[PDB]
């Protein structure tokens, strides 16, 4: 779900690191974001961000 999150934003904003075997999404650079509000179409991650 970290990758689906990283695709609902301008691509540089959510940098998906690999802290453990699992993948964690982190907000690397908020400034690159264009307001497209494409998370709000996800219906499961509009509650997370």
């Amino acid at each position: 779900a970290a990758e689906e999150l990283s695709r609902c934003f301008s691509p540089g904003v959510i940098e998906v690191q690999e802290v453990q075997g699992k993948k964690v999404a982190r907000v690397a650079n908020p400034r690159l974001d264009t307001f497209s509000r494409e998370i709000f179409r996800n219906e499961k991650l509009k509650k997370v961000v």
Partner: protein, 51 residues
């Protein structure tokens, strides 16, 4: 020695020339249906924010 009326004909034949029907195949169109408009592959964003 003249011409006289003879016996009435017993039947009539009417001839016409006719060809026949082929199988129904119903080949509607070369490239058929209304083919849908669609996505160019990959595309990519052609615009970025400032900063």
């Amino acid at each position: 020695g003249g011409l006289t009326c003879a016996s009435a004909p017993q039947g009539t034949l009417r001839i016409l020339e006719g060809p026949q029907q082929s199988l129904s195949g119903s080949p509607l169109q070369p490239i058929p249906a209304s083919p849908p408009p669609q996505i160019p592959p990959g595309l990519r964003p052609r615009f970025c924010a400032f900063g």
